[PDB]
Structure formats: C-alpha cells, structure tokens
PDB file of C-alpha atoms in Angstrom:
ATOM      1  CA  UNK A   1       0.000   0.000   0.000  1.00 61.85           C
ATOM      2  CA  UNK A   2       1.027   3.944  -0.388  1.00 60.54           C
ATOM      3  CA  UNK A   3       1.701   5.579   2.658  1.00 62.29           C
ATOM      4  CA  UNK A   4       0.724   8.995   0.913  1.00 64.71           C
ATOM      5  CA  UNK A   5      -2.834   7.368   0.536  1.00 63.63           C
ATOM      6  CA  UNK A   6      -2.754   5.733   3.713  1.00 61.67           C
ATOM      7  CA  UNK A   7      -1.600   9.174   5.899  1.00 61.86           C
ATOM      8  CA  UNK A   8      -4.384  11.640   3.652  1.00 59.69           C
ATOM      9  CA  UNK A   9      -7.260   8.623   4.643  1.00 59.88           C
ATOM     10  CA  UNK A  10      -5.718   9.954   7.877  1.00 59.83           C
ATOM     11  CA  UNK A  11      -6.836  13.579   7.345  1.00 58.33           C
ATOM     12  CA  UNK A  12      -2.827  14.758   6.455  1.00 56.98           C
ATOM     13  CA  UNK A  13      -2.066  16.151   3.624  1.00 57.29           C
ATOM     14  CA  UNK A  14       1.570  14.208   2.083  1.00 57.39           C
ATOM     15  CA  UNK A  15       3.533  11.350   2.743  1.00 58.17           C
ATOM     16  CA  UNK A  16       6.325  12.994   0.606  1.00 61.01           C
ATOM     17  CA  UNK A  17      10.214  12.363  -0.066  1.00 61.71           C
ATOM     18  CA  UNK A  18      13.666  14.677  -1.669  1.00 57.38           C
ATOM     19  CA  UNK A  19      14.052  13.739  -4.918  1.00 57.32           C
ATOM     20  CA  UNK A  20      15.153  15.578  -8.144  1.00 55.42           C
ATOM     21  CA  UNK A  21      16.348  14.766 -11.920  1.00 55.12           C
ATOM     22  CA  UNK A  22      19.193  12.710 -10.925  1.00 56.11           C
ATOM     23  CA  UNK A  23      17.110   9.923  -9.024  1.00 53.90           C
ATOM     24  CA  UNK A  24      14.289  10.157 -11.592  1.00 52.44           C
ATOM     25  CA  UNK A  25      16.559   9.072 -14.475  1.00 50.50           C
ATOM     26  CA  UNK A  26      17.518   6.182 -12.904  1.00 51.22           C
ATOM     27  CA  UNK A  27      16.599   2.679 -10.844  1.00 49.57           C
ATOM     28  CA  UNK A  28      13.321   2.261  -9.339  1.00 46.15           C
ATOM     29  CA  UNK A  29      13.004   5.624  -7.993  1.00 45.43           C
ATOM     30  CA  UNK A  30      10.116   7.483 -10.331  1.00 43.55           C
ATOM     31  CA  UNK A  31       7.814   4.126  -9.968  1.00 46.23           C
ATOM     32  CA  UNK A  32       8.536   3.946  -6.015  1.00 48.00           C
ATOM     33  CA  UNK A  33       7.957   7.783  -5.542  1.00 48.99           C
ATOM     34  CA  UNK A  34       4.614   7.210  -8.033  1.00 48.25           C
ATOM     35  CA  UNK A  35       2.915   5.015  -6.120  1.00 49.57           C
ATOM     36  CA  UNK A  36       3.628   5.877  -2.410  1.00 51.75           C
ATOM     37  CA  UNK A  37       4.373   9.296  -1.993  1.00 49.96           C
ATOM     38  CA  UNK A  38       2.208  12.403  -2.841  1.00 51.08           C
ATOM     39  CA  UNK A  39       4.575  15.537  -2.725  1.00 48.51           C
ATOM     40  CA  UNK A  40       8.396  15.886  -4.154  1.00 52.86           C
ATOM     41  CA  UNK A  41      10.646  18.220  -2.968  1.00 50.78           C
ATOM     42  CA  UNK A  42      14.271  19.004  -4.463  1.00 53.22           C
ATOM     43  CA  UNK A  43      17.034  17.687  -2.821  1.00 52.66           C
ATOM     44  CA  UNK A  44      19.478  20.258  -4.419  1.00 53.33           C
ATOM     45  CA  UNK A  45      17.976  22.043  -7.867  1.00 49.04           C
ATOM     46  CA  UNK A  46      16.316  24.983  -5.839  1.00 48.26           C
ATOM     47  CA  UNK A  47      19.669  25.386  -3.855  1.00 48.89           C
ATOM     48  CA  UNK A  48      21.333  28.934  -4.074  1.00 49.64           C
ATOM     49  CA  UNK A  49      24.425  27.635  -6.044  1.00 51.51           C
ATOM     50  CA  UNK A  50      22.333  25.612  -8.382  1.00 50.93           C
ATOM     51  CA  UNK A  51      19.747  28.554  -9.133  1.00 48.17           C
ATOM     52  CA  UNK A  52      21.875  31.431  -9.139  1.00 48.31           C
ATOM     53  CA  UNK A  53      25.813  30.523  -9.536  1.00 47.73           C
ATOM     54  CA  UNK A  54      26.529  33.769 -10.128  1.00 50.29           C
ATOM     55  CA  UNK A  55      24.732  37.172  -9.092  1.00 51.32           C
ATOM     56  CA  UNK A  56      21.509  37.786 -11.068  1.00 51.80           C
ATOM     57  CA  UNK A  57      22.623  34.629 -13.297  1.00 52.75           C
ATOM     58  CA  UNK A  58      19.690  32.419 -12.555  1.00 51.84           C
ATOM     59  CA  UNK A  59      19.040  28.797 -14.068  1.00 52.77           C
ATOM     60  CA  UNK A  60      16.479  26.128 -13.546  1.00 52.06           C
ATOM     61  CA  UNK A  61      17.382  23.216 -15.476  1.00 50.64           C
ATOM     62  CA  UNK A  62      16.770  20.827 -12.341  1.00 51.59           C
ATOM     63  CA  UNK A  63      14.463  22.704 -10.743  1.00 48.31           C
ATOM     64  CA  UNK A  64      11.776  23.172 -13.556  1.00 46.97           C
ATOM     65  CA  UNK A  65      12.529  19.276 -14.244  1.00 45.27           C
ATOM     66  CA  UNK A  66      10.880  18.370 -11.028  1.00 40.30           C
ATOM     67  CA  UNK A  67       8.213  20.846 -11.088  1.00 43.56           C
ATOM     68  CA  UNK A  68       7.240  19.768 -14.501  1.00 43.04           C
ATOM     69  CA  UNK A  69       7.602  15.996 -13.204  1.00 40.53           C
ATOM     70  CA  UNK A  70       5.300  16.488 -10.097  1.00 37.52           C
ATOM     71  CA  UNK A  71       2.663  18.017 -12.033  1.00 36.53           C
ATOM     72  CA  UNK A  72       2.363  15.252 -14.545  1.00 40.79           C
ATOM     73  CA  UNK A  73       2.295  12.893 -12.054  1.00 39.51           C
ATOM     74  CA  UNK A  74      -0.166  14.497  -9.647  1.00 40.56           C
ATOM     75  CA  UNK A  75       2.816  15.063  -6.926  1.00 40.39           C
ATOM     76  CA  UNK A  76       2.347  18.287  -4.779  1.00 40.39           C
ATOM     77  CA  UNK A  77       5.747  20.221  -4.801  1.00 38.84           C
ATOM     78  CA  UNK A  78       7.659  21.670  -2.193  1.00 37.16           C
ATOM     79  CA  UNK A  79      11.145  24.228  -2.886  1.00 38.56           C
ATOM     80  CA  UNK A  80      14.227  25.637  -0.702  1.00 42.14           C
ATOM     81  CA  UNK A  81      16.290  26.140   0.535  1.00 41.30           C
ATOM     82  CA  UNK A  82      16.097  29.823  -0.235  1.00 42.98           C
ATOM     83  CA  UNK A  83      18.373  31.132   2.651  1.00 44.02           C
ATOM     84  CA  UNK A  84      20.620  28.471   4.056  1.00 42.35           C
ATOM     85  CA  UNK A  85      24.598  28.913   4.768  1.00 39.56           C
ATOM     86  CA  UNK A  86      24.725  25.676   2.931  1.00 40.23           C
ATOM     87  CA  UNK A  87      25.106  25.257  -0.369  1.00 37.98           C
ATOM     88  CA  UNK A  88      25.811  28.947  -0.921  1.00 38.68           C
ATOM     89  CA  UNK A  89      28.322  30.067  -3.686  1.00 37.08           C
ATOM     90  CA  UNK A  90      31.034  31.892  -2.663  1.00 37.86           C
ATOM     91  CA  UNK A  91      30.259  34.809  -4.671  1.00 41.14           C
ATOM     92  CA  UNK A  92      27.276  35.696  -1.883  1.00 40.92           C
ATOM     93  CA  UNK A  93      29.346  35.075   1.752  1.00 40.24           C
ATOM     94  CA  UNK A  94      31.542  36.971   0.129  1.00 38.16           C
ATOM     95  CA  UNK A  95      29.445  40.114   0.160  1.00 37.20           C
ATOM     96  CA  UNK A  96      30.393  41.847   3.568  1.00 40.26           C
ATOM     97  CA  UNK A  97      27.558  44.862   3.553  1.00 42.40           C
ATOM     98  CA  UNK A  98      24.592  44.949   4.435  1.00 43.25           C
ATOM     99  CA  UNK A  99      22.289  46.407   1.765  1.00 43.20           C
ATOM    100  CA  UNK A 100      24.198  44.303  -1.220  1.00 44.78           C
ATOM    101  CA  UNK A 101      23.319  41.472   0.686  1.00 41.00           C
ATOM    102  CA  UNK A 102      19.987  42.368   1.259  1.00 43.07           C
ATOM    103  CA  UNK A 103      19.313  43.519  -2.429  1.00 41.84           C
ATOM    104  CA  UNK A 104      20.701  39.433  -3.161  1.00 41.31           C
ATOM    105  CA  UNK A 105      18.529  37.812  -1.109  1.00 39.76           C
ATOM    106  CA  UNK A 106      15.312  39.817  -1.941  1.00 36.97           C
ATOM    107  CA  UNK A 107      16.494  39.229  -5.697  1.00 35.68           C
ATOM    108  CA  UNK A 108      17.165  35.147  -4.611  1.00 38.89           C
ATOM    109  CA  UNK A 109      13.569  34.891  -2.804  1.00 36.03           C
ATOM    110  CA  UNK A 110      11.532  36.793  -5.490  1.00 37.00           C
ATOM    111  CA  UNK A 111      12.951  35.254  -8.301  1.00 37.57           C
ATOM    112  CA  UNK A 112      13.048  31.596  -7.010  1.00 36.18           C
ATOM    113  CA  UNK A 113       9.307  32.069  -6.024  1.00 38.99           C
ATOM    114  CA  UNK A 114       8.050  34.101  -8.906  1.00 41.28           C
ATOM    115  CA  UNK A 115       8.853  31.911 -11.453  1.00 42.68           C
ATOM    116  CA  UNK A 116       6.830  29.141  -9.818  1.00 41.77           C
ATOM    117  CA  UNK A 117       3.971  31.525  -8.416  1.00 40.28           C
ATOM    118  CA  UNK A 118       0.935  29.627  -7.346  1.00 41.66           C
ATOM    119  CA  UNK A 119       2.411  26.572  -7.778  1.00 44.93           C
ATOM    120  CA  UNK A 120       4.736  25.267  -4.956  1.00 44.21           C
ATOM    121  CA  UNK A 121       2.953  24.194  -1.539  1.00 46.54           C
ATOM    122  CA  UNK A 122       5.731  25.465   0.666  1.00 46.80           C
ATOM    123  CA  UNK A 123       9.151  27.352   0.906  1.00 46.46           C
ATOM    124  CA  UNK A 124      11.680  26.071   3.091  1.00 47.15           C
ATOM    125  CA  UNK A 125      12.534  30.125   3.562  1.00 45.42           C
ATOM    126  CA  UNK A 126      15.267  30.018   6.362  1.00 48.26           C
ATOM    127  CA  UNK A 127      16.920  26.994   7.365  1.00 45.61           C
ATOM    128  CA  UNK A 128      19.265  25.893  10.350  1.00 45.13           C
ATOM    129  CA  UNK A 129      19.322  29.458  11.606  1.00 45.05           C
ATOM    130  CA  UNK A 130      20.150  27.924  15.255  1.00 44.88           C
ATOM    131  CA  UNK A 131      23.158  27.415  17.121  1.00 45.61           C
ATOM    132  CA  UNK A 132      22.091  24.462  19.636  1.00 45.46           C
ATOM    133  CA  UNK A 133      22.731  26.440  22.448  1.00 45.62           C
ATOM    134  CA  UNK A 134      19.364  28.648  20.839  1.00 48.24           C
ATOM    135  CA  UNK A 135      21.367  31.474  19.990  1.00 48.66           C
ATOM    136  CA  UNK A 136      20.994  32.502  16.203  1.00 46.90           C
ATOM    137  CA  UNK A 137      23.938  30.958  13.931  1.00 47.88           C
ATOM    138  CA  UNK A 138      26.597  33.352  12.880  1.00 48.40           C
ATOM    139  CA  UNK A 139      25.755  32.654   8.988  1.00 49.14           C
ATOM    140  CA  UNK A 140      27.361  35.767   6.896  1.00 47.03           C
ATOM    141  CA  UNK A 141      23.251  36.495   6.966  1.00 45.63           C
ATOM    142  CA  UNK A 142      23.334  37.566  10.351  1.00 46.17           C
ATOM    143  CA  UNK A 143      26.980  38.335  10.221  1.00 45.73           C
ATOM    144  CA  UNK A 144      26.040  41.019   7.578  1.00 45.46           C
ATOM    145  CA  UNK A 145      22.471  41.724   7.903  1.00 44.60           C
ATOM    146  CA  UNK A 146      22.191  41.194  11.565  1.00 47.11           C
ATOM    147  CA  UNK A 147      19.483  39.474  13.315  1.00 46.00           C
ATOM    148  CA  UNK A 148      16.570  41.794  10.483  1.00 48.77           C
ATOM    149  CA  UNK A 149      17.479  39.217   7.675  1.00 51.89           C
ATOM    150  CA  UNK A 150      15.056  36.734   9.392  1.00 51.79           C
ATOM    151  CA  UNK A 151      11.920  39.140   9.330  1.00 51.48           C
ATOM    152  CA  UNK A 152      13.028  40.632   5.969  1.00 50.20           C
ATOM    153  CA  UNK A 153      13.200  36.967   4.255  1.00 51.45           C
ATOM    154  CA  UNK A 154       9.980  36.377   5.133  1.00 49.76           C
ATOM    155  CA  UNK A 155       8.321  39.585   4.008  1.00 47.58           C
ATOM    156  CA  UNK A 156       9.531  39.228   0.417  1.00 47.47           C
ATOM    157  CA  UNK A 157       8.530  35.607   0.426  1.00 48.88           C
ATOM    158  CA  UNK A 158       5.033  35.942   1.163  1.00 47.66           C
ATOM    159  CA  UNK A 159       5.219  39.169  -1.646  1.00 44.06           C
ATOM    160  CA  UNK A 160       6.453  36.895  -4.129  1.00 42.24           C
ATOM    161  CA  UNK A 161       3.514  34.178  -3.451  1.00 42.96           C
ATOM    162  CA  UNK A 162       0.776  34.758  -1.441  1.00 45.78           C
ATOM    163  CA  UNK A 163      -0.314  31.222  -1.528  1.00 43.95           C
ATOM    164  CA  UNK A 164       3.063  29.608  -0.518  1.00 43.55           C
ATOM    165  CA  UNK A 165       3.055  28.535   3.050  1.00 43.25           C
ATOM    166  CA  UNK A 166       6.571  29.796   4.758  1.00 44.23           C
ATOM    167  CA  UNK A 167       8.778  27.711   6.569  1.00 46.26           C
ATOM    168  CA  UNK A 168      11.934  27.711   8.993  1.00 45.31           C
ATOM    169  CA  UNK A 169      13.510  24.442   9.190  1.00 46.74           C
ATOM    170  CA  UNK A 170      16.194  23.430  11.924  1.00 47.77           C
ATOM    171  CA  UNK A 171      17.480  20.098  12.809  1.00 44.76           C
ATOM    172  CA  UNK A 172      18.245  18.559  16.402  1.00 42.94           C
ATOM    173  CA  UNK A 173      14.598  19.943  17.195  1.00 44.79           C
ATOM    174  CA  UNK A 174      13.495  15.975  18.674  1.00 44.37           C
ATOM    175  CA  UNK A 175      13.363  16.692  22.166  1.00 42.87           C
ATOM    176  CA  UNK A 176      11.742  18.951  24.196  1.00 44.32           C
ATOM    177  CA  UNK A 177      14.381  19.570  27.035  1.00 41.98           C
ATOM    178  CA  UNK A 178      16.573  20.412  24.425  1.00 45.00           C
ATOM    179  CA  UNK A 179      17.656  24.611  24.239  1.00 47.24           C
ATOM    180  CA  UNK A 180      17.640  24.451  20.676  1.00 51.90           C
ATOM    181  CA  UNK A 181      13.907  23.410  20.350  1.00 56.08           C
ATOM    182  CA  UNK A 182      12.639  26.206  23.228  1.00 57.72           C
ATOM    183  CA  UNK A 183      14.762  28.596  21.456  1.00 61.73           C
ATOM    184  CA  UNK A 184      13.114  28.260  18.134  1.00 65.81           C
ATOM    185  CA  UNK A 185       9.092  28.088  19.785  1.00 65.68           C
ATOM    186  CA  UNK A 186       9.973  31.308  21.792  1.00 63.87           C
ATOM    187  CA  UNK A 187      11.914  33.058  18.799  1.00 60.48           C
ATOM    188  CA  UNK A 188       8.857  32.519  16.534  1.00 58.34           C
ATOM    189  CA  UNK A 189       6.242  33.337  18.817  1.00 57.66           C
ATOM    190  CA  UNK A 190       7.856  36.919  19.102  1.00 54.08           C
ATOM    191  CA  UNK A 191       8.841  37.112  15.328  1.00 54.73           C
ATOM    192  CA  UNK A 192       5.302  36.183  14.489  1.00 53.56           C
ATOM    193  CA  UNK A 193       3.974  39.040  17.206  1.00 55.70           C
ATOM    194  CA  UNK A 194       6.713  41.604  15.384  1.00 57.78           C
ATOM    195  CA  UNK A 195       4.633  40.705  12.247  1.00 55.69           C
ATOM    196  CA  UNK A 196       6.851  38.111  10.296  1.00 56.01           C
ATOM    197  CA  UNK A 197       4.830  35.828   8.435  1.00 58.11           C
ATOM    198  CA  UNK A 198       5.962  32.287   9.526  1.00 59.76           C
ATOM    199  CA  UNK A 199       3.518  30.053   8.741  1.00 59.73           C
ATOM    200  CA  UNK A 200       5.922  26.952   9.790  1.00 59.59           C
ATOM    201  CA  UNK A 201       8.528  25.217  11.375  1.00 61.92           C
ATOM    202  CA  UNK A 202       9.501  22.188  10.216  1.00 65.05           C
ATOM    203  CA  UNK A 203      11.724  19.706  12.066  1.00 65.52           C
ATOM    204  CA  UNK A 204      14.700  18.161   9.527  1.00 67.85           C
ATOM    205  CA  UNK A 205      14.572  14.886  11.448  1.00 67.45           C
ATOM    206  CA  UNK A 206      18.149  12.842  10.942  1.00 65.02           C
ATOM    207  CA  UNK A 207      17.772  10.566  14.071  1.00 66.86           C
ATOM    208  CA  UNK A 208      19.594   7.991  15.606  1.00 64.07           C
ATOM    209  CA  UNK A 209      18.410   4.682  16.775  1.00 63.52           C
ATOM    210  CA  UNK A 210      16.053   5.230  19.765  1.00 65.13           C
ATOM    211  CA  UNK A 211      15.337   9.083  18.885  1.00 65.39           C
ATOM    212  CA  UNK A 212      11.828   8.728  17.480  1.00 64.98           C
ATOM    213  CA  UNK A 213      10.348   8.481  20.956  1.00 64.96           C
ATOM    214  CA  UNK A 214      11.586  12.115  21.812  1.00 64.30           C
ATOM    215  CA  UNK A 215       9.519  13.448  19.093  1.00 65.02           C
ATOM    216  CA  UNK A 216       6.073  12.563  20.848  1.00 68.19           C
ATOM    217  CA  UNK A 217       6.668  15.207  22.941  1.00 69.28           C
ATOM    218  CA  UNK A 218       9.095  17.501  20.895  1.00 69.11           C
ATOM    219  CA  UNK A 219       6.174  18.234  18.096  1.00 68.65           C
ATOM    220  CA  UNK A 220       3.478  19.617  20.073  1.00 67.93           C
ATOM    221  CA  UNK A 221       6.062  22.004  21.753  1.00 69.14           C
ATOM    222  CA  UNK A 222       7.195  23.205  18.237  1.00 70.53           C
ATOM    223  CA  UNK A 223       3.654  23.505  17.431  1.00 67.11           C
ATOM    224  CA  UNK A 224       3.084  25.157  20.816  1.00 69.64           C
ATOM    225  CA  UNK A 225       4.519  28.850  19.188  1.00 66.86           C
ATOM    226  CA  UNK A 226       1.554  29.528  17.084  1.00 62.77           C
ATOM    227  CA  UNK A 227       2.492  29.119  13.086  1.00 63.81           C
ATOM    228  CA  UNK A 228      -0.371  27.531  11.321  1.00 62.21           C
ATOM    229  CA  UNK A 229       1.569  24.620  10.606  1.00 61.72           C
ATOM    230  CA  UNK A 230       4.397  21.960  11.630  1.00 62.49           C
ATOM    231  CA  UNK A 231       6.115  19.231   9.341  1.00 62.10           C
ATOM    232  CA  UNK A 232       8.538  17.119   9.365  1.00 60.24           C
ATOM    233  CA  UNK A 233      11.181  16.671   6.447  1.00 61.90           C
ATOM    234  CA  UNK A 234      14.528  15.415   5.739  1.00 60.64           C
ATOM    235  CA  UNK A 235      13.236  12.337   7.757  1.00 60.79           C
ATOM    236  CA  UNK A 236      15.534   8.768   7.922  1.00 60.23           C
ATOM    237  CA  UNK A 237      16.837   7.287  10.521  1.00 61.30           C
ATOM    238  CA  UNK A 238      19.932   5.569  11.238  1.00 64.23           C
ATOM    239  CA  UNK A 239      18.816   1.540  11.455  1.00 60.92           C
ATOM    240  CA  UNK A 240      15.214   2.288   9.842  1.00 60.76           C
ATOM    241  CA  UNK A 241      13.471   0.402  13.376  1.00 60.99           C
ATOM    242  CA  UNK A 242      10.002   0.172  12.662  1.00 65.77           C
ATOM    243  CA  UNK A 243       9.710   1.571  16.033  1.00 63.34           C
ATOM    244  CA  UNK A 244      11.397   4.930  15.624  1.00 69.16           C
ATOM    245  CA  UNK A 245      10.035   5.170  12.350  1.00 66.44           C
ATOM    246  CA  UNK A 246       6.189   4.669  13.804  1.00 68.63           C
ATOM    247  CA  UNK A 247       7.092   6.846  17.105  1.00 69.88           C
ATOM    248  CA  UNK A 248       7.494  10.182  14.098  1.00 69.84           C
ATOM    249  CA  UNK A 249       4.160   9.099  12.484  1.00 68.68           C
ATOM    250  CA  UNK A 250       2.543   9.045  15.624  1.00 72.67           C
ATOM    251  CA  UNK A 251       3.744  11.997  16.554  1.00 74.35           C
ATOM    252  CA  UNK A 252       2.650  13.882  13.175  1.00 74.05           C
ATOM    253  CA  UNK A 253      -0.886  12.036  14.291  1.00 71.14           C
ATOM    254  CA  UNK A 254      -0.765  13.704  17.362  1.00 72.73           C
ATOM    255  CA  UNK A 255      -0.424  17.208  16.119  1.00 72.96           C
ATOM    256  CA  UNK A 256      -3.150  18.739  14.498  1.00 72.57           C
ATOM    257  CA  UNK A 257      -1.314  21.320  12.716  1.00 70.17           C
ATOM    258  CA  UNK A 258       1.115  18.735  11.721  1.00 66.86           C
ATOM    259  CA  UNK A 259       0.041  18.436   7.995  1.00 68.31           C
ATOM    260  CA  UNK A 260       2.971  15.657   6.669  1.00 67.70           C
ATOM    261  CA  UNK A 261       6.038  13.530   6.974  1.00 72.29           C
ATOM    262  CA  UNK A 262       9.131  14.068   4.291  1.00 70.43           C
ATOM    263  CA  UNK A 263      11.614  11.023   3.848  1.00 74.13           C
ATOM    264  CA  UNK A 264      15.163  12.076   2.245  1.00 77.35           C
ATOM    265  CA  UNK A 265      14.838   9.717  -0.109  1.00 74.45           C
ATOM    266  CA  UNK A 266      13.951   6.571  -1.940  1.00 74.18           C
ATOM    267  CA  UNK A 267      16.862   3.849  -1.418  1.00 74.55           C
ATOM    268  CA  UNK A 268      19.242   3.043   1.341  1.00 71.91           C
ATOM    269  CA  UNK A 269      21.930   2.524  -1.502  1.00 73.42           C
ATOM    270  CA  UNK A 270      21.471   6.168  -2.265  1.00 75.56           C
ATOM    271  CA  UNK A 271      21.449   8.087   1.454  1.00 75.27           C
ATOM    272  CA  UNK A 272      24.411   9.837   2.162  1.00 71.70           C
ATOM    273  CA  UNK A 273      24.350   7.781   5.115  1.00 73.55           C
ATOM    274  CA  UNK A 274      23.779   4.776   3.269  1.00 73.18           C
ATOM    275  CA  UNK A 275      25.223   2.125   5.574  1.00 71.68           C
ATOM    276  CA  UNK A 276      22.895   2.954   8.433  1.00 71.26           C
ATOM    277  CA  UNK A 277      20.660   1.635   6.083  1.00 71.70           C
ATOM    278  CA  UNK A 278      17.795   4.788   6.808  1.00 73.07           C
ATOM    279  CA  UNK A 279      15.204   4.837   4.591  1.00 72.63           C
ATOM    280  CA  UNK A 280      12.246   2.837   4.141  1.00 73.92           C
ATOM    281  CA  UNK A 281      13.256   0.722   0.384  1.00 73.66           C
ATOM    282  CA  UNK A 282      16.506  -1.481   0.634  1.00 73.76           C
ATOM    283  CA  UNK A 283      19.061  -2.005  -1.766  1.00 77.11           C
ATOM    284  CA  UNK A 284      16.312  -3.876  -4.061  1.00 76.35           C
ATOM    285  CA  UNK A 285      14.262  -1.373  -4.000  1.00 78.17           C
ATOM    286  CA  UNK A 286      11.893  -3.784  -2.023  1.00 80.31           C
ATOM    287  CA  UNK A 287       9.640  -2.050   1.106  1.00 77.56           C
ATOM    288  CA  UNK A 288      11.454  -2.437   4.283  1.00 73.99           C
ATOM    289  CA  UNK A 289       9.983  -3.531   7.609  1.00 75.45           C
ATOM    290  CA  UNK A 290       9.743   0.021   8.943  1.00 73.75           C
ATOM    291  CA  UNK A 291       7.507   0.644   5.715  1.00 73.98           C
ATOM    292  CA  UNK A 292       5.297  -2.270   6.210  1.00 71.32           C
ATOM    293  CA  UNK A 293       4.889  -0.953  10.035  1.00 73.93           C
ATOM    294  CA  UNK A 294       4.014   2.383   8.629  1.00 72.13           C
ATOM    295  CA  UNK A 295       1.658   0.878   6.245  1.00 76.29           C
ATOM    296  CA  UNK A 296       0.318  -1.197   9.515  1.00 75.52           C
ATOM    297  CA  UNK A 297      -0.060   2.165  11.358  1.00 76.88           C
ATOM    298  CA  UNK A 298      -1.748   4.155   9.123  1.00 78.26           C
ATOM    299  CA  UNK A 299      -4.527   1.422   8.340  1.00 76.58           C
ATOM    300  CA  UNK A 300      -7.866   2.024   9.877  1.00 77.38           C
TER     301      UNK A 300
END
C-alpha cells in the first residue's frame, strides 16, 4: 500500500520524499515515488548555487525538471532552501555589507518564487538558523544583515507568493528539554507578534536509533509557538526500526497542525548515510519492515 494514501485517509495532507532529476533518471526511484508518496521536494535544484551561480545569473534546469515531473504525475511540490549557509556560492558570503546582501537575497527569494507563483505548496525560507545552544547561527546572513534578515526573508517571500506557506527548518529539534527546540518556539512566537509571516517550522529529522520516541513530545512544543503549521522533512533514521520510524508518524498524528512527513529519499543505496541503512526501500528497492509498520499504522 502507499503511505501517501494511507496518511491523507488519515486527514494529512503528504507522505512525501527529496528527490530531483538525478534519481528520476535512474533505478526504481520514479515508480517507487509514483505510487507511495504524494509531494516531491528538491534535494538540491532549488539550492542557491544551483539557481543562481553567479549574481543575477539564474538557471532552472533541475528545478523546472521536477516541477514539470510532479505536475504530470499528480505530486504536490515543495522548494528551498532559499536562505541556508549551505550550499551557498562563494560569490554571496563573500558580500560583507549589508544592503548588497539584502538587495541578493530579496532578488534570490523573489525570483526563485516568482517563477513558480501559485504553484509550490511550501518554501523552506530560512533553514538551520540555530546554534544548539538557541542562539541565532553566525551565517554571513546575520553576520552582515544582523538578526533583520530573518523578518526581511519572510516579508519578500510571502510578496512573491501569497499562496506559498513559509517555513523555517532546523534540525536537532526531537526533544523537548533540548535549548535548541525552546529557542526556536519562543523566537517565533515573538517574530510572528513583530509581524513576520511564519507560517511553519519544520523539524529536519536525521535521528539515531532510539530518537523517534523524543519526538512525541518535541512536536506539540514546536507547534506550541503559534504558526499555522508543523512538518517534518529530511526524515531517515539511522537503522530504519520500525519503532522509531512509527514513534514520528505518531507523533505527526498527534499534532493537528502537523500536515505531513518528508523522507530524504527513496533507497538506502542512495542516502548519504547509506550504511545505516535509513530509509524505508533497501538495496532492491523492495519495502522495508519500517515501511510495512508504517503501512500497519496508518490502516484504519
């Protein structure tokens, strides 16, 4: 069975996994991601250096190969990451003032989103932003722009498409004693009081063995500052144990504003953690025990 179908019979609204051009080319990947997942989102086309290599250069040869895939195969569509210290040419941490690198990143956002307009589900607008201590990460963003780039990322998303829900993304978010998760609930709940439309925070969940049971009570807290929404994305886990993997679908379950679960990828061959074996289709592309227990799960 499709987990996609299974978790919308549910009431959510994707089962969905990182893909792009690469993966669909080859193996089993297009007639896996077909028949059990319901949204795509880009592993690396919509990244800064892949869109816009040099300044006001901008290409989309990946990017509009996905979006042009998921709509003839009835996949919703996700993008991002639009402001990220990864995957970031040189050419932009270079910049060292502030308006110039506000000018790039309006430029970045609007044209990233405009060309798309109406069409995406969601922007992954600011990702790992955190130090884990819950101080903001010293990214050449804040280095540059100081702690405004946040709010100002935001606003020009949500001009570009009205319709795109607007995410921040952060990893190591799976427990709730953690600083790093507190930090990002209480930092949201004032940026969306100062007026910055957030409309999400989603959890980029690379767990360890054992971590899925933190995540029962780590979601609702994230979903305790407000935003309209929660996911989770960039989901495997190290081992794939049914257990961990059912402990994150519960916990998506559990949250109302929770609206779906991304897996970062197909095959365990093709992780770049392969050997921990994370995903949820093995080497043969065959469905995995943590799959079946998702499948089991969702049923009802």
């Amino acid at each position: 069975q499709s987990i996609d179908q299974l978790i919308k019979a549910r009431g959510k609204v994707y089962f969905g996994v990182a893909t792009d051009q690469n993966r669909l080319t080859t193996g089993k990947n297009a007639a896996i991601i077909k028949a059990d997942f319901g949204m795509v989102w880009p592993e690396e086309s919509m990244q800064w250096d892949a869109t816009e290599p040099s300044q006001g250069n901008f290409n989309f040869a990946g990017a509009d190969y996905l979006v042009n895939w998921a709509q003839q195969n009835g996949k919703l569509i996700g993008g991002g990451m639009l402001v990220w210290h990864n995957q970031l040419p040189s050419w932009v941490s270079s910049i060292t003032d502030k308006n110039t690198l506000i000018n790039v990143m309006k430029n970045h956002i609007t044209t990233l989103m405009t060309r798309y307009k109406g069409k995406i589900r969601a922007w992954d607008v600011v990702g790992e932003a955190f130090n884990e201590d819950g101080s903001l990460r010293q990214n050449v963003f804040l280095n540059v722009i100081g702690e405004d780039y946040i709010p100002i990322a935001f606003q020009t998303a949500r001009a570009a498409d009205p319709n795109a829900k607007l995410y921040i993304m952060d990893y190591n978010l799976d427990s709730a004693s953690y600083p790093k998760t507190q930090a990002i609930v209480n930092r949201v709940k004032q940026w969306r009081a100062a007026g910055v439309p957030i409309d999400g925070i989603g959890s980029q969940m690379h767990l360890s063995a054992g971590q899925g049971a933190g995540v029962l009570q780590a979601l609702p807290l994230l979903a305790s500052a407000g935003t309209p929404e929660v996911s989770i994305l960039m989901l495997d886990v190290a081992g794939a144990s049914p257990t961990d993997y059912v402990n994150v679908v519960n916990a998506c379950l559990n949250v109302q504003s929770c609206v779906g679960i991304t897996v970062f990828g197909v095959a365990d061959p093709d992780s770049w953690r392969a050997s921990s074996t994370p995903l949820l289709f093995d080497g043969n592309f065959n469905p995995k025990p943590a799959y079946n227990a998702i499948v089991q799960n969702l049923q009802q």
